[PDB]
């Protein structure tokens, strides 16, 4: 309770382990190949979560990184969680497409950039140089957003109707949802420090139940996730 | 020599070098493609267990953990072996039966799970809590012992007689060596310290042997790896 | 500029960068899956490159190592990039020859093992010591190079000639190019420190450019990349 962003963490604890186990408990029985993947999938993402959530209430999670001459709190678990579980979410996404698999190693991989970057950015004691990291990691993300909305062109002809309609609610809960990370960033503890860590830790928490929970609860209940039979 | 638990390491560097020359030998030849897949994942594991017991030997994977109230000698190579070898042994077993991939994934990230939060309980500083990462990181240990005997199911109705027989005798290896690593941990070393260092690292070299060269000499001279013809 | 090397870490940092736009650009408008994959892979080489050259430039990826007696100056992030960009060189070349899943899993993990014992090589601070995991380091690159020599002989009877041809003049570029690492990192600031520094990375910059840079400009010249049609 000694850091008054410990509430948000908390709760972050809570939302996903809540999730992780209703996501377990609802994917017994399913026998579907394809349904397995993206219950996998999706439960594993609110279960890491849940993990590196509780990591940061612990406090193993948090370190001090010395720029700007302070000391500042940076949580460097994020960047161990969304290491795994945002090249997950993108690959459920591209499961959903049926994606080419040179698709799936360019969003993974830019993926894997865009989360290295903000961890190198997020524990940089040069302040100005965390914000060549952070354009940089952006300009990752915003590769992804291209490929999600312009890299599967040649799959629109042999999509099924319920799996492009869920693709595209997915797409847009993702774009809108990642984009405000960058934001919260920059202006939060580990850029600018124009909006407190409390409110920060906050913020994020709300993006990555949202983001985690919110979206495998609209996939999960989505017929898209079976092959069709 | 001056670490008293030196002679185990000292033996789990030898017996794992030696255990990956016999399978690297025994798998000169082998032309088969799924043969191959298991030569090339069974002899990695002993490989990469040979390079983090010499780590440990030289000193370099041992670090020094304040809890309690003490400095403690924690051995983190051990996390970084696991972390690639575990999976591994589970893609052995999930491709004897031909699992689905959703099933792979689940058993490959509860493994990813196991092993950092028992990495994190391993790294914790405050005493208590290490016992919490312990507990979850048993809770995915459980899952995936579940998942081993309850989760290929569809899978029976077309198994080759000797596949099913060799994956039994391996998933009954498996779950019996790997459900003495909590215990050996939460009396060790790393959790309630009744059992000194020297002697936990004979059992896990003893453990670590049987789980990588014992099972794999039981699964390398199987005629379950070749596809039949 | 306070450092010596900082001109050779510019330039590669420029020269992967460039690479990077140049490969990404050049893929625009490919619809072939198989195409699609090689430039995805061979895409992510230089931009993960640039990230970790940028990172030695600004100073994050430098660490000092005490061994004999000095504080030394070990660039850690050069395995951050390895450790991600080799096994992907590696694949380029296994899917050439549509290598079988095993040969590729045999590559992919020697390849870890590679990078990670030279990485702990590199942070070990017993001298001597810092000789035996360059020698494993050194075993496992042979193996690597053996099998690319002598692993894919059952694809020989169905090879399209083209992809033969390319295959062979980037395996004779790999197999050149990265022996001279070991040798490198012997003589350099790594090893016996026969070879300053500023030269080293020198050495290295070459070497990475012409192995990610160099290496791609051929491949991605090649008809091989397209499934023929
Ligand atoms: C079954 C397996 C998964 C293995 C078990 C692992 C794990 C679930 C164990 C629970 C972890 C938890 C008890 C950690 C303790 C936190 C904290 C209370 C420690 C001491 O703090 C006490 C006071 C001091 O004034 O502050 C805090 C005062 C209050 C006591 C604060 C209490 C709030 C909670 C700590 C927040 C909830 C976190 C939960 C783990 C959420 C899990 C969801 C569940 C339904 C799956
Ligand atoms: C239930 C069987 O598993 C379902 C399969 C098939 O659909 O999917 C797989 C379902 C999931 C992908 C499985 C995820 C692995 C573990 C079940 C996660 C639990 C491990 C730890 C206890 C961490 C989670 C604790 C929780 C409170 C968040
Ligand atoms: C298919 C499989 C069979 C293949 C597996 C092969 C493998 C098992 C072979 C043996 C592995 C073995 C050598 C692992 C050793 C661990 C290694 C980190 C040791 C180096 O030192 C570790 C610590 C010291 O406390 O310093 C840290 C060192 C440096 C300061 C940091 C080095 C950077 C890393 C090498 C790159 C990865 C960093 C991140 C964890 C990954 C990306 C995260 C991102 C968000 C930045
Ligand atoms: C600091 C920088 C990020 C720069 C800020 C401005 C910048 C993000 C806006 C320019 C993006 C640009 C691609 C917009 C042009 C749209 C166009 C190409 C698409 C064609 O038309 C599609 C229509 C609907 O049918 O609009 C639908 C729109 C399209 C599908 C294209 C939109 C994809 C974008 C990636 C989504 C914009 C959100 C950003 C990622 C915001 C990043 C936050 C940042 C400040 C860290
Ligand atoms: C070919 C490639 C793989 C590359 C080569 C790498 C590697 C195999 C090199 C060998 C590593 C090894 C020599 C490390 C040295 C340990 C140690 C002796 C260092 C100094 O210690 C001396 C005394 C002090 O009183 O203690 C110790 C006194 C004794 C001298 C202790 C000797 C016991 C051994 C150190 C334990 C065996 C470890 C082996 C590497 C096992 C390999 C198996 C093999 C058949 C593949
Ligand atoms: C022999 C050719 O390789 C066999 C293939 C096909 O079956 O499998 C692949 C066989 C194995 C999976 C290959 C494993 C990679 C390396 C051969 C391991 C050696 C690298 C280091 C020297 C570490 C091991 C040293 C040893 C003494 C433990
Ligand atoms: C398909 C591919 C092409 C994709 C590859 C993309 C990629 C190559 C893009 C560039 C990668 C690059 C940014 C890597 C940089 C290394 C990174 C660790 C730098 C951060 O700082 C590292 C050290 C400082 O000495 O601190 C350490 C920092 C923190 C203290 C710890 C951060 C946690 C990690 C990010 C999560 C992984 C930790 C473990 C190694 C993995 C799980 C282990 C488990 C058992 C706990
Ligand atoms: C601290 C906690 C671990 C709690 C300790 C007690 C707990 C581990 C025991 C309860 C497990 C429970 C699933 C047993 C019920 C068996 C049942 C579901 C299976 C049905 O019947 C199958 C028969 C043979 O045909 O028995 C064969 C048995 C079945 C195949 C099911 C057994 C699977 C288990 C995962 C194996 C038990 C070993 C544990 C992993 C021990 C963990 C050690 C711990 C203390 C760290
Ligand atoms: C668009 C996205 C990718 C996001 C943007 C991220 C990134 C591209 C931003 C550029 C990074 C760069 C400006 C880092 C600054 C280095 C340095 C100048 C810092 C201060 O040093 C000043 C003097 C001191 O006497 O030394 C140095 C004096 C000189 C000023 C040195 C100048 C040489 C360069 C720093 C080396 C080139 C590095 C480039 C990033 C190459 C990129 C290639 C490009 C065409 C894609
Ligand atoms: C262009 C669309 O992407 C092409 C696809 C299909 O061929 O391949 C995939 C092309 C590549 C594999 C995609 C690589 C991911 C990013 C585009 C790399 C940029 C992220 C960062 C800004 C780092 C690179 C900066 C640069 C200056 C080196
Ligand atoms: C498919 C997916 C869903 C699966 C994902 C599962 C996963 C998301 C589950 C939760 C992950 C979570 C526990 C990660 C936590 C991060 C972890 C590193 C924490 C340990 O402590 C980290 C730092 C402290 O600053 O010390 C460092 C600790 C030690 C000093 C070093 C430990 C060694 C590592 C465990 C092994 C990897 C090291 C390298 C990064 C990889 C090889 C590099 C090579 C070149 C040596
Ligand atoms: C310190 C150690 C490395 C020892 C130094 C000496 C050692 C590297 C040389 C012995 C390697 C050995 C396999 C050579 C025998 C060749 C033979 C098996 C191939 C059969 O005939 C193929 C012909 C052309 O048709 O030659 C073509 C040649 C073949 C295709 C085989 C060559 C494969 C090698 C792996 C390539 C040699 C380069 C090394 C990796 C150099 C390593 C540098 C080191 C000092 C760190
Ligand atoms: C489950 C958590 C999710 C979906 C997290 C997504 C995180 C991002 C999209 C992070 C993006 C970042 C930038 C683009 C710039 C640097 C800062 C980051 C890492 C926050
Ligand atoms: C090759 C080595 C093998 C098979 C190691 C297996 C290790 C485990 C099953 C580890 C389990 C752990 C727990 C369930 C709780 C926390 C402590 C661990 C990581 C030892
Ligand atoms: C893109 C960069 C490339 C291709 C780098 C290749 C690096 C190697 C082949 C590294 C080899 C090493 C040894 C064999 C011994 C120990 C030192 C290393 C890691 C430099």
Redesign the interface.
């Known amino acids: 309770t000694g850091r008054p962003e410990w509430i948000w963490l908390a709760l972050g604890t809570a939302l996903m382990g809540l999730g992780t186990l209703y996501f377990l408990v609802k994917g017994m029985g399913v026998?579907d190949?394809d349904?397995?993947?993206?219950?996998?999938?999706t439960?594993?993402v609110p279960?890491?979560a849940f993990?590196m959530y509780?990591?940061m209430l612990?406090?193993?999670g948090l370190t001090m990184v010395p720029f700007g001459g302070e000391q500042n709190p940076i949580y460097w678990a994020r960047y161990?969680d969304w290491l795994?579980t945002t090249p997950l979410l993108l690959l459920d996404l591209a499961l959903l497409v049926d994606a080419?698999?040179?698709?799936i190693?360019?969003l993974v991989?830019?993926d894997?950039?865009m989360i290295?970057?903000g961890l190198?950015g997020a524990?940089?004691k040069?302040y100005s140089?965390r914000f060549?990291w952070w354009a940089?990691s952006t300009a990752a993300m915003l590769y992804i957003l291209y490929v999600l909305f312009f890299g599967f062109t040649?799959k629109a002809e042999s999509m099924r109707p319920e799996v492009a309609s869920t693709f595209k609610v997915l797409r847009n809960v993702t774009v809108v949802l990642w984009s405000a990370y960058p934001v919260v960033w920059l202006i939060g503890s580990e850029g600018a420090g124009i909006v407190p860590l409390n409110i920060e830790t906050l913020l994020f928490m709300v993006l990555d139940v949202s983001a985690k929970v919110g979206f495998g609860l609209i996939l999960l209940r989505s017929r898209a996730i079976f092959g069709e039979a």
Request: hydrophobic letters at 50%.
């Open positions: 026998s190949p349904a397995k993947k993206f219950y996998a999938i439960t594993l279960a890491i993990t509780l990591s612990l406090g193993y161990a795994f080419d698999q040179g698709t190693l360019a991989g830019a894997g950039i290295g970057t190198v524990l940089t040069v140089y060549v940089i040649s």
